[PDB]
Structure 1
């Protein structure tokens, strides 16, 4: 692969939108890094997930790569070194340090990731590019704005449109279990995944479940051959490689929405249709192997473009408005994503301890951006957990249709009733478990 010379020039942002599997991560990336080093550029590589980052550092092992952990706010050497980190790690460091290096070449892989930390990162990056302080490459077949759900592939894909179960089934879906080979099944939620996986397991199928929280331990198991089904949330759209012959995709997802009628709260709306980019990335899990031309994409429904009510857009602004810049400037969203919110640049900016608490609630507290923002801008200290118990009766959190009760750090049994309700902290057993740990003052 021959690298273009102009992509290393400051004020240039290159959208590397080669089709899924074309060789963006595996082939051109090491070529770009080596060429960046030759030019003595201060280089940053951004991976969507910890797993993908680990694959990058394994592949770039011969080069002066340094993986950067979010447990560390900055890490500067007096040496020629390429920094490697997750999208979210970059955004956290921007919020928590003034010692963020002045990278003049930034590569964001799987730059289609729509999680707020990634949207915020693209905002900061593009701002630096447009200010003439950096060159950046966004690697993704589906850049922000894409609407082709059936892009080019390395090998032919059989696109099959048919009814897909939303829940456990007894009969009428023989084609699912009769299939000889491996399947990746995209589900709209973890608990939808729990039910589907349970159904497949009672049929004697070996299934691995994937979600954001379990991705690190569960994904490596898919690299072995002792499995029939992967049941996964949208997280697998971000550079997850499966050696499988089929994707099952009912093209559905949950969408966080900030509601403003009465007390502000985040709900999880849907299931709703995925975006055409998401559908393409799910489909793009297969058709990757030149030697295997039998791959199937089994789908249901049309994708939906309009996602302007997605909470991730205002959450991205809450992050961006609090990002430290050398000049003191407020960075704006990436061009094509500016339309997604009506927020006035800088309206979410916090000062002093409130800004510090905002960051702490996200990184140490594991809370969503919106929820962290509401607590921090209320003037509440990080260790002060009273808000988890002082909400209105409607804010009572249920588990198995019964009221959740928590032992506090002071040793009192209080009903879990937060002042601010964000559906994501009680969306599934694991999220609730983590949030109970927060409410009981255990982190």
Structure 2
């Protein structure tokens, strides 16, 4: 009645060590849908200890289903295939205890430029090139590409227009007057609330995917019936919503390490996104079946020197600390080597400081740069003194009101961290978490 052609045809040598397969599976295809289960089951058949890396908590679910029925361990008791987020795996790589000797590693959405993704990618490529494993990077925008308008499935109407930046009292029609299938990418959360409010005071109720709430409001994109989507950079990694068109002003904020007086991390004002990033934003459409009326409205042009972004040095701080049987430090994935020009091992710490470094990132929720400086200074995880003893220039304020901290010990102190990383206080939700850290309740 039927041929086993029910499940895809997985070429061979994609499991052959010393090889790195780049699956440029354009969006909407059978990427996680069918391609993965096929490859996974085939490995489980080939008796291969496997590792599956998901970019986000949400994408981890998209894979739990496509893999629902297969022997896999998530986040009996003797499975041979693991599945966790990028960050979780990289954290474990910093542990003094070696990870399993995976014969095959598959990374989903392998373009995410977060420090951890960059580190894991370096680790994986080093493993395949050593001959200890075979790797597979799954992404339509692989590191190195710069194509803002690449092939797609559904016809895309590419045309530039004047996308507003904030609240408007009049003008622009295609905005407040449309079908209701469009995604709007914005630079900051501060600005995302205005363009959002405006769409509310007009004639539409949309959803705001916050910087760190993608694992709550996303699910609602499936059908909570809305006209527009207001996200930030985060959507670019495993986000699927309802839309026939997308508004893309090609803007974003990005962490930068300054070096004037004290070294500090700033979030540089709204700047151009990367080409691959631009694609990713447009790729949210033109990936559907029969549809033909899917247009892309973009303002501004993209740039390619994302080199001053803190993530490259931060990914390096993680790699110099990766524990490897030989002791030879993992290099970065071939196409990303040229982003940082630092000596291999300039950031390697000693056993006890490395653990603190890890803890400050896992239990403290602090960015890589900040946790490294704190650990590098010999400070202990529990010792929060550094949160109040910085110079006068590091006092944090809301409107002009100096923020104070009620420690769980009873005192009321002014928030003045010794090292300043703006990622810890720009977004109110982040400031909240950090306050909890400074108070000693974490």
Please report the TM-score for the alignment, with normalisation by the length of structure 1: 0.96
Separation of aligned partners in 2, 1:228 and 1:404:
38
Deviation digits for residues 343-395 of structure 1, max 9, x if unmatched? 11111011122111100000000000000000000000111111111111111
Give the 3-state SS of the residue equivalent to 1:279 in structure 2: helix
Structure 1: give runs of 5+ residues left out of the alignment.
69-76
* Matches for 1:248-259 after TM superposition, within 5 Å: 248-259=247-258
Separation of aligned partners in 2, 1:260 and 1:200:
40
Instruction: Work out whether 1:234 is the aligned partner of 2:233.
Output: yes
- Confirm or deny: 8 A CA contact 1:188 1:252 kept in the other structure: yes
Using the TM superposition, give the Cα deviation of residue 402 of structure 1 relative to its aligned residue in structure 2, in angstroms: 2.2
CA distance 1:116–1:236, shift in 2 (3 Å): same
Deviation digits for residues 175-231 of structure 1, max 9, x if unmatched? 111011221111112222122211112113111111342111111111124212211
Instruction: Work out whether 1:8 is the aligned partner of 2:7.
Output: no
Instruction: Work out whether 1:316 is the aligned partner of 2:315.
Output: yes
Give the 3-state SS of the residue equivalent to 2:111 in structure 1: coil
Question: Corresponding residue for 1:30?
Answer: 37
The equivalent position to 1:56 in structure 2, one of 54, 60, 63, is 63
Question: Corresponding residue for 2:418?
Answer: 419
Deviation digits for residues 149-198 of structure 1, max 9, x if unmatched? 01111110111201111111111122111011221111112222122211
After the TM superposition, which of the residue ranges 401-410 and 381-390 deviates more from structure 2? 401-410
Deviation digits for residues 404-440 of structure 1, max 9, x if unmatched? 1111232211111110000100111111111111111
Separation of aligned partners in 2, 1:48 and 1:347:
27
Question: Corresponding residue for 2:296?
Answer: 297
Give the 3-state SS of the residue equivalent to 2:94 in structure 1: helix
Deviation digits for residues 55-106 of structure 1, max 9, x if unmatched? 11012101112213xxxxxxxx863432111111111111235141111100
Using the TM superposition, give the Cα deviation of residue 265 of structure 1 relative to its aligned residue in structure 2, in angstroms: 0.3
- Confirm or deny: 8 A CA contact 2:265 2:422 kept in the other structure: yes
- Confirm or deny: 8 A CA contact 2:23 2:140 kept in the other structure: yes
- Over aligned residues, Cα RMSD in angstroms? 1.3
Deviation digits for residues 269-309 of structure 1, max 9, x if unmatched? 12110000000001001112112211121110111111110
Using the TM superposition, give the Cα deviation of residue 147 of structure 1 relative to its aligned residue in structure 2, in angstroms: 0.6
Give the 3-state SS of the residue equivalent to 1:345 in structure 2: coil
After the TM superposition, which of the residue ranges 408-417 and 351-360 deviates more from structure 2? 408-417
Separation of aligned partners in 2, 1:96 and 1:240:
31
- Confirm or deny: 8 A CA contact 2:357 2:371 kept in the other structure: yes
- Confirm or deny: 8 A CA contact 1:237 1:278 kept in the other structure: yes
Structure 2: give runs of 5+ residues left out of the alignment.
1-7
Question: Corresponding residue for 2:407?
Answer: 408
Separation of aligned partners in 2, 1:204 and 1:425:
35
Question: Corresponding residue for 2:335?
Answer: 336
